[PDB]
Amino acid sequence: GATAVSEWTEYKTADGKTYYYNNRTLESTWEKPQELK
């Protein structure tokens, strides 16, 4: 069907930040995405 926006892994930066690494289209996000609630 439709290709849902997702694919969110865990990427920890040296400051201890839980940031997400968009596998969707290869992108980065600091905190929670729109669909990731």
């Binding site: 990427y11 920890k12 930066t13 040296a14 690494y21 980065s28 996000t29 600091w30």
Partner: peptide
């Protein structure tokens, strides 16, 4: 090694 994030507009 981790990537730095890009900033949001």
């Amino acid at each position: 090694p981790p990537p730095l994030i890009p900033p949001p507009p």
